[PDB]
C-alpha cells in the first residue's frame, strides 16, 4: 500500500574477508555476470577499466539496486550499490571489447581517475 | 553419563521435542487467514518492476500472487505458440525481504512454479482430466493460457505463484512472525514485458511465453496481479504470551538459481553445491544453446560426493522415472528435477557434493540453469 | 479442593476424548470389515420413485454403497439432448437415513452427497484418470458413466455411484450406528429422479435434471435399477464389561444437510449464518442464478466471516477455485464453490457466528443459493 | 465372528523381537543412505537367447530392482499391421524370479502380474504421465513407458517398460528386504524375456501373453531387446559391539510376488481358488482369460472373498468390484483383470483354505481359466556372529 516504492539491501560497509575477483569481455550481445558465492564471497565495490575499448562501460546493479554505472575511456574506482542477493549485470556499446573489471570485496575508492 | 556428546544430544532432543510440541500446538490452537493484500492493473511498456508491502501480522507462512495479462498479436500474417514455461514466464523474477530486511527467496518465476508443482506432487493447480461424466474439469480456468495470439487478437492468460516463507502448512520451519513492530515485510515482483514474453522463430525460448513467425508485432495490453497474504491467524496464548515454535520461526527456507557454463561432450559437468545449506531439491534446466531437448542430448545424470561415488548415476529416462513417481508426470523438455526432502544434501555431513550431467550433444552457448530450494538454520 | 465444575468437565471430556480415540484405536485393530447386498430392485419411475430400504442390524455400520443405472430413451422426432453439469448425479434426487432409534442422520440431495464423496476422495468420485499409459488401464468398466447426448430416437444407458455415510471414514468410526442390540430401523430412503425432474427443457432451470435439450418432452426413462450394499464391521471385540465400544463415536452423528436461501443483490454481501451447535466439517455453495450457471464471473468474491466483520479467507473466485483444485485436482461444475474446514470445523461458541459470504456481482430474477452441509454436532454443556 | 484376530498376531510374534528388529531399522535408515546404481546392461536379439541370469551387488541391505527395457520391433509383413494387446509393453518380460544370498527364491511370478503390484502399490499407471489442463508444457516429455499403439506393415516400433522387483515391501517398511553384505555368496535375478515366439500374437489367437496382435503377425520380429538393471540399497552398514546391528524380523520374512492358474470354471457355479496357510496375502489379482477373449465385466455374475465362518466378505458385481479398485488405482484394470486389496488386514487362514478367492462366471469359453497373481508376506531365520581378523 502507498506506493510506489523500493527497499534495497547492501554489503557496503563490513568486510568480513578482503578479496579481489577477475575476468571478462563481449562484443555486440548482453554479457551476464552470475554470482553462486556462498563458500567464499562478499559484495564489494567494482573497478572498471576500459582501456583501449572506449565505448561504454556499463555496471547493472541487481533488481535492489537499480545503479546504471556509466563509463567512457580509462577506468576508475566505483563502488556499486549491489544487492545482497547475488546480481551482476553488465554492458558494453561498443564492439569487440575486453572487460577487465574488478570486483572487490572490500568498500572501495568512490572516484573515478582516467 | 554420556559425557559430552551426550549433553549435546540431550539439548538437542529437548529442542527437538519442545519444537514439535510447540508445532502441534500452534497447528490446533489457531487460525489460518489469507487476505488480499494489493492488487495493481498495469501496462508493463510503462512499468514492470513492483514493490509491494505485506501487512505485518503474526506468523506470515507465505504468499498467493494471481496474475491475469491480455496479450495482442498484430503481426500482419503469422501467429505465435507457448513456449514450453508459457505463463510461468509471467514474473520474470521475485525476491523477498523480512522485516529485518533480511533477503529469503531470490529467483525466476519459472523456478518458482517447478518448486510449486514439485511441492504438490503434481502440476501446480492444474486440473486433471478423467472420464467423469459429471462437469468437473477445467471450469475456472485458474492456471490457463490461449496457445496461440493471431493478429489483432487480445488474449487473457492467468497464472498462479506460491511464495513460500514457512515450509508447508505443517512445518513452520520458514514461517514469519509479523509481531516485531518496526520491522516490516518486502515483495519485489519483476514482470514480463514486450522484450522478455516474445521470442522470434531461432531465438532463445527459455524467458518467452510466445515464441513464433508473429513476435515482433506482439504486445502485451495489460497485466494484472493481486497478491494474498497467508495466516495461520487467531494464535494460541499462554502465560509466556503467544505459543510459538521458536526454532521454525528463526529457521529460514529460500529458493534461488543460477547459470553454469562450461559443458563439453561427454565429460562430467559438475556443479558444486554451495556448501552449509540444507538443499531440499535441484532443478538443472539444460538450455542446449536455445534448444531444450528430451534428454535425448545427454548421457546421464546424477548426485555424487567427494569420493567420485555416485548415490544416483542415471540415464534421462530413469532419472525422469524418478520424477514421475514425484510429480505424476514430467517437466517440460530439458528439465530435471531432485528430491533430497527427507536426506537434504549438507556438505561438512559427508564432503562436497556436486550435481552432475555428462552430456551427448552441446550446442553453443549451452548453459546448466540451476534452481535450489534450501535451509539455513543455526549453523 | 476447590471443585472448578467449568475445569473439571473439560479435564472429563480430555479423559473422555482419549478413551474415545483408544478405544477406536482397538477397535480397529481387532473385527473384520465386510461389504454385502441388501437389495436390489428394477423398476420403472413413472410407476414408483421412492423406496425405503431396510438395512440388515449387523454389528457397527460405517456407510452403504449405492449403485444406480438407468435406461434413457429420446423419442423426440428430431431433437437431442444434452447432460446437465451435475448429469448422473441427479438420478437420486433425495436420500434420508435414519438409525434404529427412529434418529435421523443424512438428509439431503443426490448432487449433494455425490460432491461430498468427490470431495472425500481427493478427485472425482470413482472417475477413471486419464493417462499416457500404453497397457489399456482407462475407463474399462464404466462404473460412474453418462452418454454426453441421446440423439432424437436413440436410447442411452447409464450408471452412477453414492456412498451414504454414517462412519466419517474406514479409520474414524464417528457417526457409525451400533448394533449390539435391539433397536427400530433405519430407513434408508431413495427418492429417485422420475421423467419430470430429469429432463429440461431448453430455458428451464437445469438444477436437478440430467439431460436438458430441445428434445426434452420427449424423453423417458425406460427403468431405473439400484443394489444397495451394507459396508459394516463384524466380530466386534469383547472385554470385560461385553463390547468394546467407543462410545463417543457411536453417539456422535455424522451429517449432511442441504437447503436453500434467497435475498441476493449485486455487490452487496449475502451472508448464510451458520446454525450454531453443529461442527461444520465442509460447505458446499451452488450459485443457481435463475437457472443459469456460471463459472464465477458473476460473483465478486466468497468468503468465510465470523462475529467482529474479520474474513479468513476473502478471495475472488479465480483464487477460491485454487484452494478447491488443491483439494479435488480440479474443479467443480459452473457455479458450485467448496470449502474444506475438516481440521478445525467451523463451531459457533467456539469464536462467535459464523457466515458464509457471496457477494455478487450480477443477480438474475428467481437467484438463490444452495448451501450444502457436513457435519458433526453434539451437544452441548455449562454452569457458572 | 470373523477369523483370524489380531491376538494371534501378539501370539505369533516376540514384542521384544520386533520392537528391537524396529528399532535397529530405524538406526539403520537413519545412520544409511539410500543408493540406486547401475548393476547391468545388456543388448541381444531374441532369436539367439532370451533368458539371463543378473547377479546383483552384496552390498548392504537390498530394497530392490528396477528393471528398464528397451525393444525395437519391426513388422516385416508386406501389407497387413499389428496392434497393442491389452497388456502390450508389460509383456516385454515374460517372467522373473529372484534367489537371495542363502538360495531362497523370494518373487516368482509373470511380467504382467509384477507390472499389475508395481501400478497396484503406485496408486496410479505404473510410472505413467498423467493428463492435466496445465499449458505449461509437463506431459510426456520422457517416454518413459511407451510403445506404439500400431505398427503399421514395413514399419519399425520402439518401445520402453521399466518393472520395479522388491525385496522390501517400501520405501519405509523393509520388511522382505535382504541383508547382503559382501561376503561374497551370489544372488540370482533371473529374467526371460519376450521372444519372436511370444510377443505376437494371430488374429484370433490368445493374446494373453503378447505384446502386439494383428494380421501381420506371422511376421513380425524383434530388431533387438536392450535391458539394465539398477539396484536399490542402503548403504553404511552399521556397526555395534556385537557387530553388525541388524533388523531381524525383516530380514527372516519374505515379501514375494507369486503367480499361479486355475481351470474347471462352469457358467453360474462358484470357481473358488483356496489360499494357502501361512502366507498373509496383500493382495489378490484375478485375470479371466475366457478361452483368449477379455471381457469388461460382461461374462461373470459376482466376485467374492469367501470365507470360513461368514460367508463372503465382500460379494460384489463387476462394476462394483471395479469401484472398489478405482478407489486404489485411479482407473481401471485392462479388460479381465480384477484386483483385490488386502494390505490393512492380510487374508492369513492358519488352515489351508479357510478362505478362497471367488469368481462365478456367467458365460464360459473353451479353455477357460484363471490366472492368478499375489502378493504376501511369510517368514523364512535369524542369529547374531560373524568375525574377522586379519
Not at chain 2, 271 to 289: C, E, K, M, P
Request: net charge negative; hydrophobic share 35%.
Amino acid at each position: 500500500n502507498p506506493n510506489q516504492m523500493t527497499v534495497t539491501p547492501v554489503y557496503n560497509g563490513c568486510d568480513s574477508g578482503e578479496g579481489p575477483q577477475s575476468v571478462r569481455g563481449y562484443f555486440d550481445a548482453v554479457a551476464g555476470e552470475n554470482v553462486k558465492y556462498d563458500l567464499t564471497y562478499l559484495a564489494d565495490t567494482q573497478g572498471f577499466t576500459g582501456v583501449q575499448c572506449i565505448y561504454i562501460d556499463n555496471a547493472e546493479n541487481d533488481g535492489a539496486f537499480e545503479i546504471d554505472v556509466e563509463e567512457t575511456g580509462q577506468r576508475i574506482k566505483c563502488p556499486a550499490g549491489k544487492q545482497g542477493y547475488f546480481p551482476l549485470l553488465v554492458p558494453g556499446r561498443a564492439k569487440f571489447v575486453a572487460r577487465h573489471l574488478g570486483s572487490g570485496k572490500k568498500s572501495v575508492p568512490l572516484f573515478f581517475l582516467n | 553419563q554420556l559425557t559430552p556428546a551426550q549433553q549435546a544430544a540431550l539439548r538437542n532432543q529437548q529442542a527437538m521435542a519442545a519444537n514439535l510440541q510447540a508445532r502441534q500446538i500452534v497447528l490446533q490452537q489457531s487460525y489460518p487467514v489469507i487476505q488480499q493484500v494489493e492488487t495493481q492493473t498495469f501496462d508493463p511498456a510503462n512499468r514492470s518492476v513492483f514493490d509491494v508491502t505485506p501487512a505485518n501480522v503474526g506468523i506470515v507462512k507465505g504468499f498467493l500472487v494471481k496474475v491475469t495479462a491480455a496479450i495482442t498479436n498484430n503481426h500482419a500474417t503469422e501467429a505465435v505458440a507457448l513456449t514450453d514455461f508459457g505463463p510461468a514466464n509471467l514474473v520474470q523474477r521475485v525476491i523477498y525481504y523480512d522485516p529485518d530486511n533480511q533477503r529469503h527467496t531470490e529467483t525466476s518465476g519459472w523456478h518458482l512454479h517447478f518448486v510449486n508443482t514439485a511441492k504438490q506432487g503434481a502440476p501446480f493447480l492444474s486440473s486433471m482430466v478423467t472420464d467423469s461424466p459429471i462437469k468437473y474439469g477445467d471450469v475456472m480456468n485458474v492456471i490457463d493460457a490461449p496457445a496461440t495470439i493471431a493478429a489483432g487478437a487480445t488474449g487473457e492468460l492467468t497464472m498462479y505463484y506460491w511464495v513460500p516463507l514457512a515450509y508447508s502448512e505443517t512445518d513452520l520451519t520458514g514461517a514469519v512472525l509479523a509481531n516485531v513492530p518496526q520491522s516490516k515485510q518486502r515483495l519485489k515482483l519483476e514482470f514480463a514485458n514486450n522484450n522478455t514474453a516474445f521470442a522470434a522463430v531461432g531465438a532463445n525460448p527459455l524467458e518467452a511465453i510466445y515464441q513464433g513467425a508473429g513476435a515482433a508485432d506482439c504486445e502485451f495490453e495489460e497485466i494484472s496481479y493481486t497478491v494474498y497474504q497467508s495466516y495461520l491467524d487467531q494464535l494460541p496464548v499462554g502465560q509466556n504470551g503467544y505459543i510459538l515454535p521458536l526454532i521454525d520461526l528463526s529457521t529460514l527456507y529460500n529458493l534461488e538459481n543460477s547459470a553454469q557454463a562450461g559443458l563439453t561432450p561427454n565429460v562430467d559437468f559438475v556443479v558444486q553445491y554451495a556448501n552449509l545449506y540444507r538443499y531440499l531439491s535441484t532443478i538443472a534446466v539444460f538450455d542446449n544453446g536455445g534448444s531444450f531437448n528430451a534428454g535425448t542430448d545427454i548421457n546421464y545424470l546424477s548426485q555424487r560426493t567427494a569420493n567420485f561415488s555416485d548415490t544416483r548415476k542415471l540415464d534421462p529416462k530413469t532419472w525422469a522415472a524418478q520424477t514421475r513417481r514425484r510429480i505424476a508426470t514430467d517437466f517440460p523438455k530439458g528439465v530435471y528435477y531432485c528430491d533430497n526432502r527427507d536426506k537434504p544434501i549438507y556438505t561438512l555431513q559427508y564432503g562436497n557434493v556436486g550435481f552432475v550431467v555428462n552430456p551427448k550433444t552441446v550446442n553453443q552457448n549451452a548453459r546448466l540453469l540451476m534452481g535450489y530450494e534450501y535451509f539455513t538454520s543455526r549453523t
